[PDB]
Amino acid sequence: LSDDFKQISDPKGYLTYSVKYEDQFTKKDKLRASEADDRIVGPTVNLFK
Amino acid sequence: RYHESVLEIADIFDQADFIQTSDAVRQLRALMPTLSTSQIRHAIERIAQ
Amino acid sequence: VSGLLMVLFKVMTDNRLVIVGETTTPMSNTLSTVVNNVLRTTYHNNVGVNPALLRDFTQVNWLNRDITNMLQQAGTKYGLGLTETRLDYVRLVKTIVGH
Amino acid sequence: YGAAVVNIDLNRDFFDTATGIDLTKGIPLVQDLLVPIGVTAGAEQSAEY
Amino acid sequence: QHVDAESIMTAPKGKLFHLQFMDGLLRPEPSAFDPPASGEDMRLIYPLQPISVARSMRAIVNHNEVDRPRGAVAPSSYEMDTGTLSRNGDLLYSPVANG
Amino acid sequence: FVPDVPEGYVAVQYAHRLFSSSLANKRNRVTYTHPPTGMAYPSPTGRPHVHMTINERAGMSKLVADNIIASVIKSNWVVDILDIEYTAEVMTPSEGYTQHVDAESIMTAPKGKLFHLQFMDGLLRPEPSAFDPPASGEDMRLIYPLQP
Amino acid sequence: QHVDAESIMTAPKGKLFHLQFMDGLLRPEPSAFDPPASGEDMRLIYPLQP
């Protein structure tokens, strides 16, 4: 009847983190942690270089 | 002050016609990495296979 | 201002029903325990950024020391993935999962 | 006369790969039994054992 | 950029110019020996109210001398408090010793 | 055979809190602080008889950790990595070794991977000759098994 | 250079090798923030007289 709701898998928020790197350090080496945890920690760390 | 022990059930019941197996299992399940229901469906599905 | 209501009118008709997407389940004995106390069974195979998922896991010593500490508070306690499930009676399968 | 270390293996003769348990290393080491659903094993994992 | 004061001073009462401050904290301390240079560099327009509100984490680097680099934020115990989910559906911060 | 630890050595539970990164004689030596009595010791060589215990091992930077391993060498620091789960071999001297674990890997291996190591049989080695050209520099060994 | 000790140790009693010290005093103090490096650099031969 009232089709009001659209299915989605990974939802985004109306807010997020925006960092600005002082490209002086950082290395760009995209830090390599474990594999299992690369995925859990995964992005947060990549973002917070 | 603990001596956390297994107390193999049989050393409690006198009518050992129900009691079975042993403390040997806690030893083993202690190792299994706690699984989820979805996880077991898999362990079983692949054993049966 | 026109952009503010707009962002707002957007929130107004922004109706979506999430439906648990591709979610893995780390093998447990393969995650530093700092991560584990933090984890909870499955967890969306698409986690986003979040200062906490980086305690005892980032060079920067200060910040790390405080975060590792910040979590020590009686209040705040981070979490992640499948936190609570209710599952239909009648046909005993699992309905809505609180992630 | 001159054998150095002698070990009591588990013997593949009976636990042949026909059941998985691919011995070789002293560890039995099954295989894709209880994996981490949603990813891809993890070459030479610990729980394989 | 460089909002030229010509205009910051006299432009329509509307116009929304995007001036832009610098964030010197990760600035390099000139080599202890090298000879000086000679123009002081200044700025002739300062925001009249506390800016940077979105700045919730500042200076993610670790000074070598003094644990906490000169004034650095470090995320508040909220940007990671993930409380529960009220029965009514209003996600509410982890308790506080039985509150 | 697990080399026991001498009298001097102190018990230090490893953690991220210790190894800061400070400046000393130009350069940013990765000083280790030694809990008992705050005394940052930049250069690996000369730390102070610490028995390092690792439980974590999942948050090391490919260098703080190496430095610690580095300090193992010159300082006889004894670091016990309590979380590894490998499988031994004890394989006879006549064909000694092959799969070469290098110190960098012991340290950064994922928590899962259960790597094969292989200790020496040693006992069945025949006495060296009475005219064998003397050997000058000693053999160094690092990995030990913490349990029998 | 790098007088290899092989020889500084065992070379004719004459040979006049030209070893060479560094004069660190005008050395640059590593940027107060940048992350550390990890090999201490040393020297295994010191002149015995001023």
Q: Which chains touch D (3 or more CB pairs under 8 A)?
A: A, B, C, F
Return the biggest CA–CA distance within chain A.
58
Chain D contact set for A36 (CB, 8 A): 36, 42
Taking CA atoms, what residue in A is nearest to D36? A36
CA gap F20, F31 in Å, rounded = 6
| Pairwise CB contact (< 8 Å): C61 & F112 | no
Q: Compute the distance between CA of residue F23 and CA of residue G31 in angstroms, rounded to an integer.
A: 10
| Spatial distance between the Cα atoms of F62 and E25, rounded to a whole number of angstroms | 27
Q: Note whether F touches D: 3 CB pairs or more under 8 A.
A: yes
| D near E: at least 3 beta-carbon pairs less than 8 Å apart | no
Nearest to A17 among C11, C49, C52 (CB): C49
- Give me the phi and psi of F41, to 5 degrees please: -120, 85
> How far is Cα C45 from Cα C54, in angstroms, rounded to an integer?
17
Characterize the bridge pairing of strands C84-85 and C97-98. Answer: antiparallel
Resolution of the model in angstroms: 3.1
- DSSP labels, A1-49: -----EEESS---S--------BTB--S------SHHHHHHHHHHHH--
> F101 CA to chain A: closest CA distance, Å?
18
Structure tokens at B29: 């399940």
Nearest CA to G44 among G14, G2, G1?
A: G2
Residues of F with CB under 8 A from a CB of C: 15-17, 20-21, 56-59, 61, 110-112
Q: Do G31 and E28 touch (CB under 8 A)?
A: yes
Query: Which residues of chain A make contact with F111, given a CB cutoff of 8 A?
Result: 34, 36-37
Closest alpha carbon within chain E to G31:
E28
Q: What is the DSSP letter of C2?
A: H
Q: What residue of B is the nearest CA neighbor of D36?
A: B39
Which chains reach chain B with 3 or more Cβ–Cβ distances below 8 angstroms? C, D
Residue D45, min C-alpha distance to chain C (Å):
9
Beta bridge partners of F78: F51
| Contact call for C and B: 3+ CB–CB distances under 8 Å | yes
Q: Do B43 and D34 touch (CB under 8 A)?
A: yes
Tell me whether residues C56 and F61 touch, CB distance under 8 A.
no
Interface residues on D facing A, Cβ-Cβ cutoff 8 A: 36, 42
G28/E28 touch (CB, cutoff 8 Å), yes or no? no
Report the residue from G24, G36, G40 with minimal CB separation from F21. G36
Considering only CB atoms, which chain A residues are within 8 Å of G31? Answer: 24
Residues 55-94 of E with CB under 8 A from F: 62, 64-65, 67
For C64, the 3-state DSSP assignment is helix
State the burial class of residue D34 (Cβ atoms within 10 Å of its Cβ: 0-12, 13-18, 19+).
buried
Q: How far apart are CA F94 and CA F104, in angstroms?
A: 27
Tell me which amino acid residue C81 is.
G
The runs of H, that is alpha helices, within C1-99 are 2-12, 33-38, 61-72
- Determine contact: A1 vs chain C, CB below 8 A: no
Amino acid at position E13, single letter:
K
Residue B29, helix vs strand vs coil: helix
DSSP classification of residue F140: -
> Which residues precede chain breaks (C–N over 2.5 Å) in chain C?
none
Residue with tokens 């090999």: G39
Which helix (H) or strand (E) segment holds residue F54: the answer is strand F50-54
CB D29 within 8 A of CB D42: no
The answer to whether residues C57 and A33 touch, using CB atoms and an 8 Å cutoff, is: yes
Quickly tell me which residue has 């995925």 as its tokens. Answer: A39
* Chain D residues whose beta carbon lies within 8 Å of the beta carbon of residue A40: none
- Residues with Cβ within 8 Å of E18's Cβ and at least 6 positions away in sequence, in order, are E1, E3
Length, in residues, of chain D: 49
As a whole number of angstroms, the distance between CA F106 and CA F97 comes to 16
Q: Is B33 helix (H, G, I), strand (E, B) or coil?
A: coil
Q: Do D33 and B46 touch (CB under 8 A)?
A: yes
Q: Rounded to the nearest 10 degrees, how much is the dihedral formed by the CA atoms of C40, C44, C45, C49?
A: -90
Find all residues with CB under 8 Å of C83, minimum gap 6, and list them. Answer: C40, C98, C99, E84, E85
State both tokens at E65: 């001398």
Q: Which residues of A touch E60 (CB under 8 A)?
A: 19, 48-49
Elucidation method:
cryo-EM
